[PDB]
Amino acid sequence: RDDEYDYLFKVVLIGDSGVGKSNLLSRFTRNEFNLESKSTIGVEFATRSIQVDGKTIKAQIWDTAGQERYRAITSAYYRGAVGALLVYDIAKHLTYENVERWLKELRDHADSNIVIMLVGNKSDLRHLRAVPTDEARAFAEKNGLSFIETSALDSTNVEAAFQTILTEIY
Amino acid sequence: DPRIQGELEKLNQSTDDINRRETELEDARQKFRSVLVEATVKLDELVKKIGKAVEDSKPYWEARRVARQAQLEAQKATQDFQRATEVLRAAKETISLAEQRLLEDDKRQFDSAWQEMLNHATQRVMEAEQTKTRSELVHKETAARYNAAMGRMRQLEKKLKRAINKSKPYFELKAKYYVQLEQLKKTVDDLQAKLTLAKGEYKMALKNLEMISDEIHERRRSSA
């Protein structure tokens, strides 16, 4: 009797594959599928319900749809979205250039009134930061978006940001 | 595989369908609380005004709701008796017409077709008189409770004449807020039912996707 909630916000995980969006919300969120659905469905589901303003809010996290197939149904993927998380790798400068394309992907299909958070995660455990934090944090505030740069070890900053995004909606 | 787009888009609509109902539920319930607290404070201020007649008239109004209740009983039993009386009228008419054909042709009493038209006709009247007498006693008993409840009410009207007059605006306002809360109760109970059907439709539109995901995994194990 812990699946009870009041509201249901919908946020999505977008960006390039391999950045580790799936493994970032491993300890926080709860994947509702016991087996990988990216290889089949293309999209994976996970959720984490918290209490905001006296009400239990269960946010629904839709994982990366993937480039290879099922791009036509990404229109329904982006629809009804409340928030979005851009996760690029700080070691790979290419992932920082593609998030500019995923942003324009939201402006075409996803809802206009969405709150997006740009996340720079250190997945590549062997390389330095090709993307400067200064220029990364500056670019995020130029598009009216939030920003946070985290690592695989300290999962403290991540969970605190997930509690903030949901509160702003209500 | 092509079933996915139909599920996600409906999962999408169901998500909004949940939030739109819980919000209305949160609103309807809030307006329900606002009235019950309003009904609570406005009833007490009438108790602090003239409370001498309020508690003394309660036996009357409680003896009046009984009279009304015993009235609907005597009213339903009358309709059920009136209906049960028309059963015999259509039954005894059939068993009377059969006797008429017996006087016309006396040799008809050996005809197997006429014996069957009597057998079923004389069977209905057996079951008709049974349901009649049962409905007849109920008609009289429910009428007795009515006349008794009319006595209980009228007698209490004599004793508490001055009482019910000073307490009349209390019970009148009490019922006005009753129906209002009753309506607000219905608008909450059904919205929480619609909310459940919204969450349920959302919970089932996820499990099928897990089935689809697990269905492909089994096909990826064997041959194409």
Short mmCIF file of C-alpha atoms in Angstrom, two decimals:
data_model
loop_
_atom_site.label_atom_id
_atom_site.label_comp_id
_atom_site.label_asym_id
_atom_site.label_seq_id
_atom_site.Cartn_x
_atom_site.Cartn_y
_atom_site.Cartn_z
CA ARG A 1 0.00 0.00 0.00
CA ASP A 2 2.74 2.44 -1.01
CA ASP A 3 1.75 2.96 -4.65
CA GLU A 4 -0.80 5.58 -3.60
CA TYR A 5 -0.32 9.07 -5.01
CA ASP A 6 -2.24 12.24 -5.88
CA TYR A 7 -0.59 13.78 -8.95
CA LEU A 8 1.41 12.27 -11.81
CA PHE A 9 4.06 14.45 -13.46
CA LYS A 10 5.79 13.21 -16.61
CA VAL A 11 9.47 13.90 -17.25
CA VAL A 12 11.69 12.51 -20.01
CA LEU A 13 15.34 11.52 -20.42
CA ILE A 14 16.82 12.73 -23.71
CA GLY A 15 20.23 13.08 -25.32
CA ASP A 16 22.81 10.76 -26.86
CA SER A 17 23.06 7.08 -25.95
CA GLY A 18 25.90 5.86 -23.74
CA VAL A 19 25.95 8.89 -21.45
CA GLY A 20 24.46 6.71 -18.72
CA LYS A 21 21.05 8.28 -18.21
CA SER A 22 19.71 4.85 -17.30
CA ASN A 23 22.42 4.16 -14.72
CA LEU A 24 22.16 7.63 -13.19
CA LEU A 25 18.65 7.14 -11.81
CA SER A 26 19.35 3.58 -10.68
CA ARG A 27 19.36 4.17 -6.92
CA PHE A 28 16.72 6.91 -7.00
CA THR A 29 13.97 5.86 -9.39
CA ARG A 30 12.33 2.44 -9.58
CA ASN A 31 12.25 0.83 -13.02
CA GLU A 32 8.80 -0.72 -13.45
CA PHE A 33 10.15 -3.22 -15.98
CA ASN A 34 12.21 -6.18 -14.79
CA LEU A 35 13.83 -6.56 -18.21
CA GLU A 36 15.36 -4.09 -20.68
CA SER A 37 12.72 -2.51 -22.92
CA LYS A 38 15.02 -0.30 -25.00
CA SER A 39 15.92 -3.28 -27.18
CA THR A 40 12.21 -4.03 -27.61
CA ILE A 41 9.90 -1.10 -26.84
CA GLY A 42 12.66 1.46 -27.28
CA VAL A 43 11.62 3.35 -24.16
CA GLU A 44 12.15 2.40 -20.51
CA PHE A 45 9.99 3.46 -17.55
CA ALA A 46 10.97 4.37 -13.99
CA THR A 47 9.30 6.34 -11.21
CA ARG A 48 9.86 7.98 -7.82
CA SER A 49 7.04 9.40 -5.70
CA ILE A 50 7.77 12.22 -3.25
CA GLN A 51 5.71 14.51 -1.02
CA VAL A 52 5.31 18.13 -2.12
CA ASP A 53 3.06 20.75 -0.48
CA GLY A 54 1.24 18.07 1.50
CA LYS A 55 0.46 15.92 -1.53
CA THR A 56 2.19 12.76 -2.75
CA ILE A 57 3.54 13.45 -6.24
CA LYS A 58 4.53 10.46 -8.36
CA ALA A 59 6.75 11.62 -11.23
CA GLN A 60 6.96 9.34 -14.27
CA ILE A 61 10.36 9.17 -15.96
CA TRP A 62 10.39 8.17 -19.63
CA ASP A 63 13.85 6.97 -20.69
CA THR A 64 15.65 7.55 -24.00
CA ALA A 65 13.68 6.34 -27.03
CA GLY A 66 16.85 5.70 -29.03
CA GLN A 67 18.06 6.84 -32.44
CA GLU A 68 17.91 3.57 -34.36
CA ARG A 69 14.18 2.85 -34.52
CA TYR A 70 10.76 4.08 -33.35
CA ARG A 71 11.50 7.74 -34.09
CA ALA A 72 8.04 8.25 -35.59
CA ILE A 73 6.40 7.47 -32.25
CA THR A 74 8.68 9.91 -30.42
CA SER A 75 5.98 12.46 -31.20
CA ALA A 76 3.76 10.69 -28.67
CA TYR A 77 6.80 10.33 -26.42
CA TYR A 78 7.34 14.09 -26.20
CA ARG A 79 3.62 14.89 -25.87
CA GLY A 80 2.18 15.43 -22.41
CA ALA A 81 5.67 15.90 -20.99
CA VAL A 82 5.99 18.20 -17.98
CA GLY A 83 9.78 18.19 -17.66
CA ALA A 84 12.90 16.99 -19.45
CA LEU A 85 16.49 16.07 -18.55
CA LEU A 86 19.34 16.65 -21.00
CA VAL A 87 22.25 14.42 -20.00
CA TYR A 88 25.47 14.95 -21.94
CA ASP A 89 28.94 13.55 -21.25
CA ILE A 90 31.52 16.10 -20.11
CA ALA A 91 34.31 14.05 -21.69
CA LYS A 92 32.62 13.87 -25.09
CA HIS A 93 32.22 17.32 -26.64
CA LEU A 94 29.91 15.77 -29.24
CA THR A 95 27.17 15.12 -26.68
CA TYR A 96 27.23 18.82 -25.76
CA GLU A 97 26.50 19.70 -29.39
CA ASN A 98 23.66 17.21 -29.78
CA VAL A 99 21.67 18.50 -26.79
CA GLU A 100 21.16 21.64 -28.86
CA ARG A 101 19.38 19.40 -31.37
CA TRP A 102 17.31 17.62 -28.72
CA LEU A 103 16.21 21.02 -27.44
CA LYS A 104 14.87 21.98 -30.86
CA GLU A 105 13.29 18.52 -30.89
CA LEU A 106 11.23 19.49 -27.83
CA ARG A 107 10.20 22.84 -29.30
CA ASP A 108 8.66 21.04 -32.28
CA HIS A 109 6.88 18.06 -30.70
CA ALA A 110 6.87 18.44 -26.91
CA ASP A 111 4.78 20.89 -24.88
CA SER A 112 5.74 24.57 -24.84
CA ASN A 113 5.37 25.00 -21.08
CA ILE A 114 8.01 22.48 -20.01
CA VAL A 115 10.85 22.84 -17.51
CA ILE A 116 14.16 21.41 -18.73
CA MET A 117 17.33 20.69 -16.74
CA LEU A 118 20.71 20.36 -18.48
CA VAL A 119 22.84 17.68 -16.81
CA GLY A 120 26.56 17.11 -17.35
CA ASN A 121 27.40 13.64 -16.07
CA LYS A 122 30.87 12.11 -15.87
CA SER A 123 30.30 8.68 -17.42
CA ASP A 124 33.67 8.31 -19.13
CA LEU A 125 35.80 7.52 -16.09
CA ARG A 126 39.08 7.91 -18.00
CA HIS A 127 38.91 11.32 -19.68
CA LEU A 128 39.11 15.00 -18.74
CA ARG A 129 36.36 17.57 -19.30
CA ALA A 130 36.27 18.58 -22.96
CA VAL A 131 33.35 20.87 -22.15
CA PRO A 132 34.03 23.79 -19.76
CA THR A 133 31.61 24.15 -16.85
CA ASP A 134 31.61 27.93 -17.34
CA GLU A 135 30.41 27.82 -20.96
CA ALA A 136 28.06 24.94 -20.17
CA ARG A 137 26.35 26.70 -17.26
CA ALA A 138 26.18 29.91 -19.28
CA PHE A 139 24.49 28.24 -22.26
CA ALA A 140 21.82 26.65 -20.07
CA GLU A 141 20.68 29.98 -18.63
CA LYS A 142 20.59 31.52 -22.11
CA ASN A 143 17.76 29.18 -23.08
CA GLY A 144 15.89 29.66 -19.81
CA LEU A 145 16.95 26.25 -18.53
CA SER A 146 18.45 24.83 -15.34
CA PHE A 147 21.90 23.24 -15.07
CA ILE A 148 23.82 20.78 -12.90
CA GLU A 149 27.12 18.94 -13.38
CA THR A 150 27.41 15.65 -11.50
CA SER A 151 29.62 12.57 -11.24
CA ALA A 152 29.03 8.84 -10.77
CA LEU A 153 30.24 8.82 -7.16
CA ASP A 154 28.46 11.70 -5.43
CA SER A 155 24.75 11.14 -6.09
CA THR A 156 23.91 13.87 -3.58
CA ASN A 157 23.43 16.78 -5.98
CA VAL A 158 21.26 14.76 -8.36
CA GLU A 159 18.49 13.73 -5.96
CA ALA A 160 18.25 17.28 -4.59
CA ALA A 161 17.53 18.57 -8.10
CA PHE A 162 14.78 16.00 -8.69
CA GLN A 163 13.02 17.23 -5.55
CA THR A 164 13.19 20.82 -6.80
CA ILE A 165 11.87 20.34 -10.34
CA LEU A 166 8.61 18.76 -9.15
CA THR A 167 7.94 21.46 -6.55
CA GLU A 168 8.15 24.23 -9.16
CA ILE A 169 5.39 22.61 -11.21
CA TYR A 170 2.89 22.69 -8.35
CA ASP B 1 5.52 -3.75 -32.25
CA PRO B 2 3.01 -1.43 -33.93
CA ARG B 3 0.78 -1.74 -30.87
CA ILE B 4 3.18 0.44 -28.89
CA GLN B 5 2.14 3.80 -30.37
CA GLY B 6 -1.46 3.10 -29.40
CA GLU B 7 -0.46 2.36 -25.81
CA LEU B 8 1.94 5.25 -25.20
CA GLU B 9 -0.47 7.84 -26.60
CA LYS B 10 -3.23 6.47 -24.37
CA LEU B 11 -0.79 6.28 -21.46
CA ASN B 12 -0.18 9.94 -22.22
CA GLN B 13 -3.87 10.86 -22.17
CA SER B 14 -4.50 8.73 -19.08
CA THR B 15 -1.74 10.63 -17.27
CA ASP B 16 -3.57 13.91 -17.85
CA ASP B 17 -6.87 12.15 -17.15
CA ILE B 18 -5.64 11.31 -13.65
CA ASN B 19 -4.47 14.83 -12.82
CA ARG B 20 -7.65 16.44 -14.15
CA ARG B 21 -9.83 14.27 -11.89
CA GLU B 22 -7.74 14.52 -8.71
CA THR B 23 -7.78 18.30 -9.11
CA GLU B 24 -11.57 18.33 -9.42
CA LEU B 25 -11.69 15.90 -6.50
CA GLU B 26 -9.43 18.19 -4.48
CA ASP B 27 -11.74 21.08 -5.37
CA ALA B 28 -15.05 19.30 -4.73
CA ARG B 29 -13.79 17.99 -1.39
CA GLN B 30 -12.54 21.44 -0.40
CA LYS B 31 -15.96 22.92 -1.14
CA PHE B 32 -17.47 20.07 0.86
CA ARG B 33 -15.41 20.87 3.94
CA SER B 34 -16.21 24.57 3.56
CA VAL B 35 -19.93 23.84 3.88
CA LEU B 36 -19.85 21.31 6.73
CA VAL B 37 -17.90 23.79 8.85
CA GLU B 38 -20.37 26.47 7.77
CA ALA B 39 -23.27 24.19 8.68
CA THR B 40 -21.59 23.42 12.00
CA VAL B 41 -21.13 27.00 13.20
CA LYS B 42 -24.54 28.21 11.99
CA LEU B 43 -26.30 25.39 13.83
CA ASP B 44 -24.54 26.13 17.13
CA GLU B 45 -25.39 29.84 17.02
CA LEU B 46 -29.04 28.81 16.79
CA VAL B 47 -28.52 26.54 19.80
CA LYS B 48 -27.02 29.44 21.77
CA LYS B 49 -30.01 31.51 20.65
CA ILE B 50 -32.98 29.31 21.54
CA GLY B 51 -31.72 25.90 22.67
CA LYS B 52 -34.68 25.33 24.96
CA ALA B 53 -36.92 24.50 22.01
CA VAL B 54 -34.36 22.67 19.87
CA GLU B 55 -33.80 19.61 22.06
CA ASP B 56 -37.49 19.51 23.00
CA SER B 57 -38.73 19.45 19.40
CA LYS B 58 -36.36 16.70 18.25
CA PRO B 59 -38.85 14.00 19.31
CA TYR B 60 -41.43 15.67 17.03
CA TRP B 61 -39.38 15.97 13.84
CA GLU B 62 -38.06 12.45 14.40
CA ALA B 63 -41.68 11.34 14.74
CA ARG B 64 -42.51 13.17 11.52
CA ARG B 65 -39.83 11.52 9.38
CA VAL B 66 -41.28 8.23 10.60
CA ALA B 67 -44.78 9.24 9.49
CA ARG B 68 -43.37 10.09 6.07
CA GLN B 69 -41.50 6.78 5.97
CA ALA B 70 -44.58 4.83 7.04
CA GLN B 71 -46.47 6.74 4.35
CA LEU B 72 -44.30 5.53 1.47
CA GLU B 73 -44.67 2.00 2.84
CA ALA B 74 -48.47 2.28 2.88
CA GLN B 75 -48.23 3.88 -0.56
CA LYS B 76 -46.08 1.13 -2.10
CA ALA B 77 -48.13 -1.64 -0.49
CA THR B 78 -51.27 -0.06 -1.94
CA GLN B 79 -49.73 -0.10 -5.42
CA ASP B 80 -48.51 -3.66 -4.92
CA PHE B 81 -51.95 -4.70 -3.68
CA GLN B 82 -53.72 -2.90 -6.53
CA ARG B 83 -51.36 -4.67 -8.93
CA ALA B 84 -51.96 -8.03 -7.23
CA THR B 85 -55.74 -7.56 -7.47
CA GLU B 86 -55.60 -7.11 -11.24
CA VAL B 87 -53.84 -10.48 -11.39
CA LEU B 88 -56.98 -12.33 -10.30
CA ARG B 89 -59.15 -10.18 -12.58
CA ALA B 90 -57.20 -11.46 -15.58
CA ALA B 91 -57.02 -14.95 -14.08
CA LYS B 92 -60.61 -15.44 -12.92
CA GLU B 93 -61.76 -14.09 -16.28
CA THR B 94 -59.89 -16.90 -18.03
CA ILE B 95 -61.34 -19.52 -15.70
CA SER B 96 -64.80 -18.03 -16.25
CA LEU B 97 -64.67 -18.01 -20.06
CA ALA B 98 -63.76 -21.70 -19.92
CA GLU B 99 -66.94 -22.45 -17.97
CA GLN B 100 -68.91 -20.52 -20.59
CA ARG B 101 -67.64 -22.80 -23.35
CA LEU B 102 -68.76 -25.72 -21.18
CA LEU B 103 -72.36 -24.48 -21.21
CA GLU B 104 -72.26 -23.84 -24.96
CA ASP B 105 -70.89 -27.31 -25.69
CA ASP B 106 -71.27 -29.82 -22.85
CA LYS B 107 -69.12 -32.32 -24.75
CA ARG B 108 -66.17 -29.93 -24.54
CA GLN B 109 -65.28 -31.27 -21.09
CA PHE B 110 -63.71 -34.31 -22.75
CA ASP B 111 -61.62 -32.27 -25.17
CA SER B 112 -57.95 -32.40 -24.17
CA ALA B 113 -57.32 -28.92 -25.57
CA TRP B 114 -60.00 -27.41 -23.32
CA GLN B 115 -58.71 -29.22 -20.23
CA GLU B 116 -55.32 -27.58 -20.78
CA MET B 117 -56.93 -24.16 -21.15
CA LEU B 118 -58.49 -24.82 -17.75
CA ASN B 119 -55.45 -26.44 -16.13
CA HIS B 120 -53.24 -23.37 -16.62
CA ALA B 121 -56.14 -21.02 -15.91
CA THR B 122 -56.99 -22.78 -12.66
CA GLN B 123 -53.28 -22.84 -11.84
CA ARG B 124 -52.92 -19.06 -12.09
CA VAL B 125 -55.85 -18.38 -9.75
CA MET B 126 -54.26 -20.62 -7.11
CA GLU B 127 -51.09 -18.54 -7.27
CA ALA B 128 -53.06 -15.31 -7.69
CA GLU B 129 -55.07 -15.63 -4.47
CA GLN B 130 -51.81 -16.42 -2.68
CA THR B 131 -50.06 -13.24 -3.81
CA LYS B 132 -53.27 -11.27 -3.25
CA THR B 133 -53.78 -12.16 0.41
CA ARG B 134 -50.07 -11.61 1.06
CA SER B 135 -50.31 -8.14 -0.49
CA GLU B 136 -53.63 -7.53 1.26
CA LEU B 137 -52.26 -7.94 4.78
CA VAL B 138 -49.21 -5.83 3.92
CA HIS B 139 -51.54 -3.13 2.59
CA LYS B 140 -53.41 -3.08 5.91
CA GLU B 141 -50.34 -3.44 8.14
CA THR B 142 -48.41 -0.64 6.43
CA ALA B 143 -51.56 1.48 6.68
CA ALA B 144 -51.72 0.71 10.40
CA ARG B 145 -48.16 1.92 10.99
CA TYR B 146 -49.08 5.07 9.07
CA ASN B 147 -52.15 5.85 11.17
CA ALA B 148 -50.13 5.12 14.30
CA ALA B 149 -47.29 7.36 13.13
CA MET B 150 -49.87 10.05 12.40
CA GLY B 151 -51.06 9.73 15.99
CA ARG B 152 -47.53 9.88 17.39
CA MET B 153 -46.88 13.00 15.33
CA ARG B 154 -50.14 14.81 16.08
CA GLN B 155 -49.94 14.08 19.81
CA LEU B 156 -46.40 15.46 19.99
CA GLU B 157 -47.63 18.50 18.07
CA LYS B 158 -49.96 19.34 20.96
CA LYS B 159 -47.30 18.93 23.65
CA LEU B 160 -44.58 20.85 21.83
CA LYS B 161 -46.61 23.52 20.02
CA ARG B 162 -44.58 26.47 21.31
CA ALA B 163 -41.41 24.38 21.12
CA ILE B 164 -41.51 23.47 17.43
CA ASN B 165 -42.31 27.07 16.51
CA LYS B 166 -39.12 28.48 18.04
CA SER B 167 -37.13 25.53 16.69
CA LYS B 168 -38.64 25.56 13.19
CA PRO B 169 -35.91 27.71 11.61
CA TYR B 170 -33.29 25.34 13.06
CA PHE B 171 -34.44 22.10 11.44
CA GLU B 172 -35.33 23.93 8.22
CA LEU B 173 -31.78 25.26 7.87
CA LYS B 174 -30.50 21.87 9.02
CA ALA B 175 -32.14 20.20 6.02
CA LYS B 176 -31.06 22.94 3.59
CA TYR B 177 -27.43 22.19 4.41
CA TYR B 178 -28.17 18.47 4.45
CA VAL B 179 -29.14 18.26 0.79
CA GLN B 180 -26.24 20.54 -0.12
CA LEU B 181 -23.74 18.26 1.61
CA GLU B 182 -25.55 15.28 0.10
CA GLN B 183 -24.97 16.65 -3.40
CA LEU B 184 -21.36 17.46 -2.52
CA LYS B 185 -20.99 13.91 -1.20
CA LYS B 186 -22.12 12.46 -4.52
CA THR B 187 -19.86 14.76 -6.54
CA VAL B 188 -16.92 13.56 -4.45
CA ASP B 189 -17.72 9.84 -4.30
CA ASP B 190 -18.11 9.57 -8.08
CA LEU B 191 -15.04 11.68 -8.87
CA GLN B 192 -12.91 9.43 -6.67
CA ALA B 193 -14.43 6.53 -8.61
CA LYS B 194 -13.51 8.17 -11.91
CA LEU B 195 -10.04 8.83 -10.49
CA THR B 196 -9.64 5.13 -9.71
CA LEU B 197 -10.69 4.18 -13.24
CA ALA B 198 -8.16 6.69 -14.56
CA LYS B 199 -5.30 5.24 -12.52
CA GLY B 200 -6.44 1.69 -13.29
CA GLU B 201 -6.54 2.35 -17.02
CA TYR B 202 -3.05 3.81 -16.67
CA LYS B 203 -1.76 0.87 -14.64
CA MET B 204 -3.07 -1.63 -17.19
CA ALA B 205 -1.68 0.31 -20.16
CA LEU B 206 1.76 -0.23 -18.63
CA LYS B 207 1.49 -3.95 -17.90
CA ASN B 208 0.67 -4.67 -21.54
CA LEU B 209 3.89 -2.93 -22.56
CA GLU B 210 5.82 -5.22 -20.21
CA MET B 211 3.98 -8.10 -21.86
CA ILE B 212 4.96 -6.77 -25.30
CA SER B 213 8.55 -6.37 -24.10
CA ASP B 214 8.59 -9.90 -22.68
CA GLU B 215 6.83 -11.27 -25.77
CA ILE B 216 9.64 -10.07 -28.04
CA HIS B 217 12.33 -11.44 -25.72
CA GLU B 218 10.84 -14.92 -26.11
CA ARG B 219 10.82 -14.51 -29.89
CA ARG B 220 14.45 -13.35 -29.84
CA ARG B 221 15.39 -16.59 -28.08
CA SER B 222 14.02 -18.96 -30.71
CA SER B 223 14.25 -18.82 -34.50
CA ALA B 224 12.86 -15.98 -36.63
#
